[PDB]
């Protein structure tokens, strides 16, 4: 009589068949924000693998908000068609389709990870980036234009429009990317802010932008459908965001009608030694969930089925997200099920294999 | 000097990157012979997973030749567009796109395996079947209208047009399905085929259909592209086909220009006890390679990386085809490379996971 890895989960009118999600993972394979056949196959395989929730990569609410020129985008109505096609593949295979709205902020305009991931200058078809202050992310990175009032309203509107498009594309779950040194986290974290205005200083100020985005997003997204935020729970130095801070943000987000905190960390700056290891971020998921009375997703080097189960049974999170493990093994849910002794049918096309 | 599982294979203008092929596997997921997003993801995924050669399922050269109403088709020019799209995805991931042309013949007009695979009547969307004699396959199956002068050269033409179509879609490997109880095998096997024409009785006779089909295909198939034929090598019964016969058939197909025999078995009639087990068809692949001096593929309950490798190292076969292993694990070649100590990188999108 406790929740396990293969217990459904209901928020609003959306029921995940189990507690396994595919974590948002950029593919750097879009053209002008448009997906290719790559995306259909990549996301499809996991939905056929048996995960209950596919969350699409960081999808840029605007061109300047992309990590790379190859980022999936949602800044035009033209983006709706190919995304809904992806939604239909995913849902025919019994998973729920979700999407991560993103803005890379001062970390935008870089090359693909597998090409060294170096900043691309505006001469080579980069673009000027934005942020809370003109403080570059690292040596060699561009000097961001600090957002003023007009730039801030633009972002909120951009998230708001993106939300409409996601709805039209048939997504039944949306996550706001407010982690990994990107625009929202950059505002939230003391390490990147020097802003003395209402969008910095105190925690109440530093959270203002995430809060305006959340409200704009939430207002466009039917109360009926799950909304998530992904946070960088800790900056992993004493002078940055701590879990305590995160808890207070989660509490405020809950009040704004967010259904789930997806609990990540890192990214605000380079050179921060982060204690990586199996389930190293689960404790953040545990704390947020207890203390902010909100559902959480746990993530980071979760690869073993019994570990995933323990996370759900121990009430440390509601959702277990797999990144790399699902890249290695899109059929992991099916193996998880047999390892734990739960019932999961493969695609009918594959019955004669199992 | 001599090869292992990850050694390239050249035939004409086509270089397979390793010795691992995906065995043709019917998906029962087409409408009027057209594929869906199911196929693109299903086939793309195994190419993403690093197999050298993707053989598409049994693709019907005519409507009547389909196993099920839901079979892939290549009887119409309409079918070119969608299949080339499948080919471009496959080729973009570094694998070679192949296709198996098929005619279910007497076993034609049945439902999906997971829907009881029971015959479907003409009143109910079924179609009258065709083949060597008027004898049904088993209790319950329709009555095959025997093929005449006319019927025969329609089948031969069909295989030939299909072949033109496959070239147009960009397939660079073609296999003729002359196994599993289907039209060509049905004519080749004494069991259940009592024909007494020049298309029956003697081996010289029983093989005529396959040889003409072979000739037709070869003529349309450019000479720099490999051609394979899958055979049932044994009927597993005393009075049926034997490795001795298959060896003779192979020797004949080598002289017709066929580049490889894909060595399967079974399917002529029900009630034949088949001694299934790991590598149970591999001695057939060995013997055909030994005595007919022709390249071969092995297939049948091969799952282990070292066994697949041992098959190639020993010269039992040139190519190892995996069916069910790849349904279960599209990424098998990546795991098999790691276990045997060969370099095989995953798609760049996935490098962070390996
Ligand atoms: C290729 C790749 C792409 C990623 N893309 C995103 C992304 O678009 N958005 C995001 O919030 N996190 C992204 N991440 C981080 C993961 O979503 C996830 O939080 C973390 O890697 C979980 O660890 P795991 O990969 O060990 O499961 C990505 C990670 C990888 C390896
Ligand atoms: C779902 C499924 C569909 C298949 N469809 C075909 C087919 O279209 N053509 C064919 O020649 N063999 C077909 N086969 C047989 C396999 O290609 C293969 O030769 C045999 O299963 C080899 O053993 P393996 O699956 O253990 O590798 C199919 C097998 C399965 C399980």
Numbering used by the authors:
A (entry chain A), B (entry chain C): 1 to 354
Show me the paper's own sentences about this structure.
Ene-reductases (ERs) from the family of the Old Yellow Enzyme (OYE; E.C. 1.6.99.1) are nicotinamide-dependent flavoproteins catalyzing the asymmetric hydrogenation of a wide panel of activated alkenes (e.g., α,β-unsaturated ketones, aldehydes, nitroalkenes, carboxylic acids, and derivatives). We selected a new thermophilic ene-reductase homologue in Chloroflexus aggregans, a peculiar filamentous bacterium. We report here on the functional and structural characterization of this new enzyme, which we called CaOYE. Produced in high yields in recombinant form, it proved to be a robust biocatalyst showing high thermostability, good solvent tolerance and a wide range of pH optimum.
CaOYE was solved and refined in C2221 orthorhombic space group, with 4 molecules per ASU. The overall structure of CaOYE shows the typical α8/β8 TIM barrel fold described till now, for all OYEs reported. The enzyme accommodates one molecule of FMN cofactor on the top of the β-barrel core, at the C-terminus side, buried within the active site cavity (for further details). The two monomers interact via at least 8 salt bridges. As already reported for the other described Class III OYEs, the C-terminus of each monomer stretches through an “Arg finger” (in our case Arg352) reaching the active site of the adjacent monomer, interacting with the respective flavin cofactor and vice versa. The difference electronic density map Fo–Fc shows an elongated organic molecule, most likely malonate, present within the crystallization precipitant agents, lying above the isoalloxazine ring of FMN. In the complex with malonate, one carboxylate oxygen of the compound forms a hydrogen bond with the side chains of His177 but not with His180. The other carboxylate moiety of malonate is involved in a network of hydrogen bonding interactions with Tyr28, Cys25 and Arg352 of the adjacent monomer that explores the active site, suggesting a role for all these residues in substrate bonding and positioning.
